[PDB]
From a paper:
A key component in the generation of cellular metabolic energy is the F1Fo ATP synthase, a biological rotary motor that converts the proton motive force (pmf) to adenosine tri-phosphate (ATP) in both oxidative phosphorylation and photophosphorylation. The enzyme is comprised of two rotary motors, termed F1 and Fo, that are coupled together by two stalks: a central “rotor” stalk and a peripheral “stator” stalk. The Fo motor spans the membrane and converts the potential energy from the pmf into mechanical rotation of the central rotor that, in turn, drives conformational changes in the catalytic F1 motor subunits to generate ATP from ADP and inorganic phosphate (Pi). Here we have used cryo-Electron Microscopy (cryo-EM) on detergent-solubilized cysteine free E. coli ATP synthase13 to probe its structure and understand its rotational dynamics and coupling.
Author numbering:
A (entry chain a): 4 to 269
B (entry chain J), C (entry chain M), E (entry chain S), F (entry chain L), G (entry chain N), H (entry chain Q), ...: 3 to 79
D (entry chain R): 3 to 78
L (entry chain H): 3 to 69
M (entry chain X), N (entry chain Y): 1 to 52
Write the structure that this text describes.
Amino acid sequence: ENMTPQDYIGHHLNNLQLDLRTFSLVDPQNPPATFWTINIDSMFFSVVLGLLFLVLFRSVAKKATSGVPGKFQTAIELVIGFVNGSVKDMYHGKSKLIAPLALTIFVWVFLMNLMDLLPIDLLPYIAEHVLGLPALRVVPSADVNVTLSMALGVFILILFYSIKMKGIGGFTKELTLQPFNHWAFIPVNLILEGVSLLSKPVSLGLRLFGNMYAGELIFILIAGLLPWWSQWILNVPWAIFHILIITLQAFIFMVLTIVYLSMASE
Amino acid sequence: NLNMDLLYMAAAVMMGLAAIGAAIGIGILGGKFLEGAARQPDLIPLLRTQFFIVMGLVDAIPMIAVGLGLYVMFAVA
Amino acid sequence: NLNMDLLYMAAAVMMGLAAIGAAIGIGILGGKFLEGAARQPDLIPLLRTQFFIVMGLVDAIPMIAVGLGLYVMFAVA
Amino acid sequence: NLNMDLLYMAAAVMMGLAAIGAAIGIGILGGKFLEGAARQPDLIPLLRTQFFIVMGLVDAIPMIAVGLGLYVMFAV
Amino acid sequence: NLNMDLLYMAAAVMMGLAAIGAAIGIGILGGKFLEGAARQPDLIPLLRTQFFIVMGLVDAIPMIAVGLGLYVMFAVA
Amino acid sequence: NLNMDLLYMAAAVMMGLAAIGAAIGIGILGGKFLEGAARQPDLIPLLRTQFFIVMGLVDAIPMIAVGLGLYVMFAVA
Amino acid sequence: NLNMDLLYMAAAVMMGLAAIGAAIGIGILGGKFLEGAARQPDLIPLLRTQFFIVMGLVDAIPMIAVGLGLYVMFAVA
Amino acid sequence: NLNMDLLYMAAAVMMGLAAIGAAIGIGILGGKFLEGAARQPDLIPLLRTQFFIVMGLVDAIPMIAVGLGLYVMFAVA
Amino acid sequence: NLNMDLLYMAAAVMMGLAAIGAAIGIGILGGKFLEGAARQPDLIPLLRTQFFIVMGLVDAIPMIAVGLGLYVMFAVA
Amino acid sequence: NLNMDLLYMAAAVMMGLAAIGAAIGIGILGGKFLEGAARQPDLIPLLRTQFFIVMGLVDAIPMIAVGLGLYVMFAVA
Amino acid sequence: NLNMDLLYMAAAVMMGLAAIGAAIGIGILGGKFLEGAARQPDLIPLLRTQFFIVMGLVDAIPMIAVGLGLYVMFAVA
Amino acid sequence: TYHLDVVSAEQQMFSGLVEKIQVTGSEGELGIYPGHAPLLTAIKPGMIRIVKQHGHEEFIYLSGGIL
Amino acid sequence: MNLNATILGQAIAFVLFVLFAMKYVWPPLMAAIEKRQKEIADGLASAERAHK
Amino acid sequence: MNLNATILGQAIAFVLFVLFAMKYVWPPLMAAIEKRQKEIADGLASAERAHK
């Protein structure tokens, strides 16, 4: 096998795009130019983990009992209580949407990030040697597309609530009078509030993206640049430390979404 | 050509400075958080709430910078 | 040609400096907000109002800096 | 030619250092302001008057620098 | 043409460092003034003047560099 | 070829700035942690819990810079 | 001709460093003076006397620097 | 030549910034450690255990920067 | 030749950095001195004696750097 | 020739940085030492022991940053 | 042309950085010493003994730098 | 306005509502307006300025105490 | 890296998981807890009148 | 390189990490679930007792 490590590390950074116009796999060596080339594996493990989440939760939502609950029920109601506390802390409106949105964000991002704890070569080995697929990397959160997708959902939600609760009048007021309060400054204020608004979802998405992209990239390097008898001593401590990052980057996405919406309405 | 010479240095500047900023800011804020906790436990959850509220704003510009660094270092070069 | 590689480097320096400034300034501010909160939590909402007020003042310049960084990096390319 | 790229560089240096200065200065000032306002929550408006007054002096040279940076990046 | 370019840099560095020194130097100073204000609202008229009297000294040199920076930026071209 | 030395220079700057940021942030946070421990010696493990939580935030960017610097230093070269 | 060009940057850096040094030092000193003034108004003139006494020591090395900067900007222009 | 020359500049900057980081961080941390000790000295062994816990976390990244500086000097020659 | 200018730059850096350091160290020291003075207005001569004692230890190295900068500008250059 | 006349610059930068890192790191640490001592002056020999315990950790990295500067000056250059 | 100028530059950076470090470290230590003095006006002798003790450690490596900068400019060049 | 009590171990020295006071705290002079955040300090011997509601100033001599 | 129409497709994948949760997961799970909490509260009310 | 050796290197670290999790991460979660089940058992025993 002609694996120069610097090219082994090259393969691993390659997604499996589906060229919609030809409805065909985009080969790694030449990348076609277009906006119409779905990343199949990243969306694939996105929807699979989301389905697993909603299935496992329906497996209790339809069977839960207000008695002494089963060991499996206990965990989901624990997560429910944690999330509900988080929401009831920072938010007081009536809207039904917030709490399930937060639950989905938390669990879904937690599982996506958790993907990265799987040994790096396992599924890429299987998927090409068994199924002949030319490229595979199996962490959904590690691509700008998924993270900016979620963040630009949250962005539209922010705009929606900020209208629904204080209308175009108050919204144009806030977009002009803060910070300096004098009508003369409004030409400047329009820009600064603009950036301070647009930045929030961008900042969210890019935080999650960067953290997980670097988490993945470390594992790639460690496995591709060291001998068998040494990879463990650096891969283990990295993964131990990475548990905390895979947790926090889901928790903070949840909390910041809650905060941005609760601040937009209230 | 020279682009893949200079742009790596550009990315390195961007990311090193972003790291300085984010690490120092979070250090200061978390330090005040901890000295708040020890002064009065039973507030740890409330102060942790407010700590995350504030931390969300600290990371904004550093995270934009890190994102653009990755973009240039991988998308363009 | 030779122009672009320096235009990227200049965006890098500009945005890295903007990042350090915004991050450390907002951290310094949030530290005092938190230590004020820990001594008397019931005032939390009033303090948070004052904090979200002043945070825009601190945020004023850095966002201009990053806006022009993006302008240089993409609109002028 | 070798010319314009260096002008963008000078403008970027000016405006980055302006960002550092203005952000850190107003951070310090606003921190002391918040602690003062937590101390005397009745006099918040008067302390806000003082805060804005001295903040005007903070941002002076940074605003001059930002003006010159926009000038150099556009007017030349 | 040759001679113009590098002087716009020298103009920058002078105003760049002058901006940081002035802004932070006055930020530190104004901070203690506000601490004094909150301890003695009855002395604001007094401390306001002592602030200015000291404020003039700190930003003396920045004012100089800003002047000469403008000079080189326009007069020396 | 002139292509390579720039890479090690860039990796060096990245990891130097990252080391500064992470070390100083963790020092600040840990110092406040130790004063808290001095005030509440029987709570030490809970404060350690919060300390590790916040340090996971602090080390966010510096570890990004470490990886990318290492990638440039070996995966590009 | 570069002698006619670099020597503007030389004075630039001299004056910039001098400006930062003087501004920061006098800011710190004036802040410690002001916070005493707020607390001990009956001492104001004595403290201000001591303040000028000490500030005379701050500007000395910065004034050496600014004089040589101007010398280079005009005498050996 | 130059291919074998700049390497020393890079390794120097790397280990110098690593040294600054480690020194400043451990200094702040040890200063707070001594403050805690001096307030209640009987606790010194426990606080020393906590200090030696935190110190490795401070030293984590600076030491990898140092290792890579050593590598660049000797192994990359 | 060209070389006659660079020594101006070496002196400029070697002297501006000493200006920074001397001004800031003396600023910190004088600030703590003025604090002690505001507390103990009956002791100011003793405190001020000791202040000069340690201020002489502070500003020593700056003077070495300043002398070398003067030598390089006027004697060598 | 550059192949050695520029190795001095590398050795300069390295131990120049290492000097400020080691200086301030002990400066901060030494500060809290004198502060504790003056509160409980009879306790100095115990605290003075702890000061040396950690002082060795502060200078660990700076010392090797000095050695490698000299080694560059005399073993390679 | 590429020999002599650069040695002055290497010495310049060595000594500028050493000056920053020595100045600010001794300034911090002296400030703490002076507040100790203001609190225990009887123990100035003991506190100053310890101040000189530790200051001996602070200024070691900065002088290791200064002497070598001199060696460069006067022995080598 | 807020309510103020100046009390000794032996007798009550003052009571009633006040607009503000100025006190020479141990760590420096000080002034308490309504809503002031909770604070505790010793005070040096000397006069304490009161301005009773409707602006009626008066000085009470305190030999020291705790505020 | 590269922006892709995947960003659009993930918006489709996202919203549905919100609605299916909102309707078929969250309220049914809130009831499960709150009914037990109500039972324990009325337990305390019985305990009150028991001695009263 | 041989891709074989890389996967052989990965497996070792993976198993070591799994054991670390098994003896430092899973136990406290089972303990928290135990504690919540315990608390609910106590609460509902206390409720039926109060009715009686």
